[PDB]
Amino acid sequence: EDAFRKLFRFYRQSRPGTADLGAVIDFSEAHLARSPKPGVPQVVRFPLNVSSVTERDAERVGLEPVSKWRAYGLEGYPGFIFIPNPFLPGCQRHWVKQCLKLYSQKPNVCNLDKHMTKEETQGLWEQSKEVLRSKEVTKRRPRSLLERLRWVTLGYHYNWDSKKYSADHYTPFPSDLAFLSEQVATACGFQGFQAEAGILNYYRLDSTLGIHVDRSELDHSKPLLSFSFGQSAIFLLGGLKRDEAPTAMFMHSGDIMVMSGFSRLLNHAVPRVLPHPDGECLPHCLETPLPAVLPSNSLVEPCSVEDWQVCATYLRTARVNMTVRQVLATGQDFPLEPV
Ligand SMILES: O=C(O)CNC(=O)C(=O)O
Ligand SMILES: [Mn+2]
């Protein structure tokens, strides 16, 4: 049991509310500049290029203007950037809706495809709307299609067996998510980001993600983008080798991580998705609705009452994580293959 497996095991069994979580960094309380607890790296502010993204562009994808964002770094982890929920009120609902209802559809790929036909999985969303609208409801029901969703891939579909990407397996990357990833990337000083591969993870309360580094992309000089919605997660950021002791931090609804530079190839994991403190409840930021009238040419779309019902009852016991990556260095193709 190395340092990483020790912290992973601990946080997986940790007791919410108690001092077990006292070392976990919480970037959403970092503006209060409370002094760091002994043993914990220091939270430093990271200055963004506030002029690099316009306010109407930021507003197209439901982002506050960059000037309103707070970004932080961690001493000891160069390149790591953490941006507490910079979404305009209600605008997380659109992205959540997209992950549950749109991105999970053919022609993207998801964990259900290996053993379920298109016709079996097509009804995913209607199935979940029907459970909500029934009086007979609750008879020790099997897990819904929505509830059996564990991953979705976009763009270049990551191959879980080979652990490689491939030009032969591609679905065009959704353009709203790509524009969102581009704003975040620019605002962090990475203009020209190519949103080429998406991996979406769907967590239940008992879900985990083990220690790994994301090294399957061909270009390691490019930042990895990570979005979080729903229940909060304990995230462990470690070192280049799998045994260095990691630093715990929270990832709350709307939080964004950007693993650039030296941090790009660090080991990390999520040992725990924490339930809401009152039980099965949304975080407060997800109770704000979308604006009545959306700007012109908005990529954020209106979310129906019936649609948000499904998302809200799902997100009470779940977390959704979107990661966006650039796969190919600019001016490079997947190598062709020799005879
Ligand atoms: O779930 C998270 O917050 C982190 N996810 C990943 O590391 C990943 O998809 O590679
Ligand atoms: Mn990862």
Side-chain angles (χ1 to χ4, degrees), residues 43 77 95 210 217 219 265 274 306 308 319 336:
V43 175
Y77 302 87
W95 298 113
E217 291 78 19
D219 186 6
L265 289 177
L274 299 160
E306 177 199 55
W308 176 245
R319 162 181 185 250
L336 291 175

Side-chain angles (χ1 to χ4, degrees), residues 201 203 209 212 214 226 235 251 268 270 319 321 323 325:
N201 303 125
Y203 292 83
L209 182 66
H212 69 284
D214 289 274
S226 184
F235 180 92
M251 202 167 188
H268 50 284
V270 18
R319 162 181 185 250
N321 164 242
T323 64
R325 310 109 186 277

